[PDB]
Structure 1
Amino acid sequence: DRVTTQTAGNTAINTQSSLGVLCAYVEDPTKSDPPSSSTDQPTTTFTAIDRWYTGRLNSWTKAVKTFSFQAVPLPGAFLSRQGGLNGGAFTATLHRHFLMKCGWQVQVQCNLTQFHQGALLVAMVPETTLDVKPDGKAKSLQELNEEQWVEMSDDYRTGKNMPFQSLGTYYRPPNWTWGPNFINPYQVTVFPHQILNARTSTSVDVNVPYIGETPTQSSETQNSWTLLVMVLVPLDYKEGATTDPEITFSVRPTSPYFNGLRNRYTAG
């Protein structure tokens, strides 16, 4: 049963190496109630947002070290058009509503074949500030193109580089040492995940529901789910094989609830 073609709206995506769909942490992340904390009528789903959206990540290479990763914030990639992920009607609905609640269906494709070795960890990781620089501003697409991969080091292991409020001249500047948005890179397999091994498959499936600190969250600021693509085993091949395989990803929202209908968002 490795051939699966999954249909949503007017978009159908196909794979011939399906490992199955990782359903965590409920038996169906589409089974869900109207959000109890808002009393206006929610804007529910319709068939032009009941569809998949496809974007591009940076190329995986021999030079990419172990545990180097790419971070795709959701819904932040739609807001920033990261990797060409234009969201159409879904992004148009995002910019016009104050609250947003949904789960996510994600599929990441990478075009491996035989005579190649390597493994990619593909996880949906709650909750990250990995899309943000240590100065507190979000990464631009130029900066995401210049990395080309985020290197694991002392920072991002301990949380030392997470965004912070400066204390000011009144206080002594403290030695920042630790933070709770660390990545423990050996433990990323606790999250809803699959492994894109070169040996066995070209695509992976993860299916996640809505989670949050509140039964709905603000459309502009939430980062409750993040598509993390992390190298476990580096790429190796002999010369004459395909250099620089590409990584694409396909994102579908599940059971969206929109609240607080208002005009298009303009920043301050």
Structure 2
Amino acid sequence: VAQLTIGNSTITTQEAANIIVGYGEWPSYCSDSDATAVDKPTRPDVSVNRFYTLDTKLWEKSSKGWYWKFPDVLTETGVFGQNAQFHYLYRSGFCIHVQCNASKFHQGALLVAILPEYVIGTVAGGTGTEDSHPPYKQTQPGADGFELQHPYVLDAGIPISQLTVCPHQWINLRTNNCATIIVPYINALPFDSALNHCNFGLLVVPISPLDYDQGATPVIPITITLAPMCSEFAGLR
């Protein structure tokens, strides 16, 4: 046991298990050239660099899986929510940390992954005749995430059977629980909007269904804690 403390926050997470650094790159600030050359972007090191602990989601024998959209997820709660709202341009890396409190008498496996530009696609009506672009609920599901309706096709006709081709980490209950992923800023632009375009999505699906002999707490809590690595903003409003 060893509790990391970076900010007015103090998560009592494991000493130092294995963390998957995304696409093999630590999120950093910027050389000296961007979508702003006579506009030196202030780099929030203040309260924009602490631990955020999203409202734990409950895993049932039936959860289809969940997903969050960055940077949206936090533009809500937080002083990082203060920045993302009062600023025009934005660039920031991350570091998610998904924990699972369960007993040795439970069992399951969660695939946790980061998928850049995660574009959803609802039923398209019901059978497939309605160009209805998903609600403002599926495009930016705040800090409480959103559930997958068709886990198999990740809600975008792509097979989850191949999701591991993204920065991912497994969470097999009989072997661990906490899993970590350091995401670097991935975009086709140095500085992009932090309110309309969501640089990516964090998925967390039960590949091996949760289960327990009858009599154990049936819902295992999944606690997602994240830390904004190298925030950057330009021009306030």
Question: TM-score band (shorter)?
Answer: 0.7 to 0.9
In structure 1, the partner of 2:72 is: 76
Equivalent position amino acid for 1:71 in 2: Y
In structure 1, the partner of 2:60 is: 61
Match of 2:10 among 9, 12, 15: 12
**TM superposition score normalised by structure 1:** 0.74
Contact map agreement 2:153 2:159 (CA 8 A) in 1: no
> By how many angstroms is 1:17 displaced?
7.1
> By how many angstroms is 1:46 displaced?
2.2
For residues 10-38 of structure 1, what are the alpha-carbon distances to aligned partners after superposition, in whole Å with 9 as ceiling and x for unaligned? 22322237532211223522364355221
In structure 1, the partner of 2:50 is: 51
Distance 1:156 1:222, change over 3 A: same
> Secondary structure of the residue that 2:24 maps to in structure 1?
coil
Match of 1:120 among 90, 101, 110: 110
- In the TM superposition, 1:180-195 aligns within 5 A as 182-195=157-170
In structure 2, the partner of 1:209 is: 184
Equivalent position amino acid for 1:16 in 2: Q
In structure 1, the partner of 2:19 is: 21
Distance 1:223 1:133, change over 3 A: farther
- In the TM superposition, 1:99-248 aligns within 5 A as 99-130=89-120, 135-136=132-133, 137-139=135-137, 149-152=147-150, 156=154, 159=156, 182-248=157-223
Contact map agreement 1:58 1:247 (CA 8 A) in 2: yes
Percent of aligned positions with the same letter in both sequences? 33
1:256 and 2:234 are equivalent in the alignment? no
> By how many angstroms is 1:47 displaced?
2.5
**TM superposition score normalised by structure 2:** 0.83
Contact map agreement 1:73 1:131 (CA 8 A) in 2: no
Contact map agreement 1:131 1:139 (CA 8 A) in 2: no
Contact map agreement 1:30 1:209 (CA 8 A) in 2: yes
- Say which one has the larger Rg: 1
Distance 1:202 1:98, change over 3 A: same
> Secondary structure of the residue that 1:104 maps to in structure 2?
coil
Name the count of aligned residue pairs. Answer: 224
Contact map agreement 2:106 2:173 (CA 8 A) in 1: yes
> Secondary structure of the residue that 2:179 maps to in structure 1?
strand
- What is the CA–CA distance in structure 2 between the aligned matches of 1:247 and 1:151, rounded to whole Å? 19
- What is the CA–CA distance in structure 1 between the aligned matches of 2:33 and 2:74, rounded to whole Å? 22
- What is the CA–CA distance in structure 2 between the aligned matches of 1:151 and 1:17, rounded to whole Å? 36
In structure 2, the partner of 1:94 is: 84
Distance 1:120 1:110, change over 3 A: same
Stretches of structure 1 that go unaligned for 5 or more consecutive residues are 160-181, 263-268
> Secondary structure of the residue that 2:23 maps to in structure 1?
coil
> By how many angstroms is 1:185 displaced?
0.6
In structure 2, the partner of 1:166 is: none
- What is the CA–CA distance in structure 1 between the aligned matches of 2:33 and 2:65, rounded to whole Å? 34
Equivalent position amino acid for 2:21 in 1: C
In structure 1, the partner of 2:128 is: none
- What is the CA–CA distance in structure 2 between the aligned matches of 1:202 and 1:17, rounded to whole Å? 13
For residues 189-211 of structure 1, what are the alpha-carbon distances to aligned partners after superposition, in whole Å with 9 as ceiling and x for unaligned? 11111111111212111001101
Greater displacement, 243-252 / 125-134: 125-134
> By how many angstroms is 1:253 displaced?
0.8
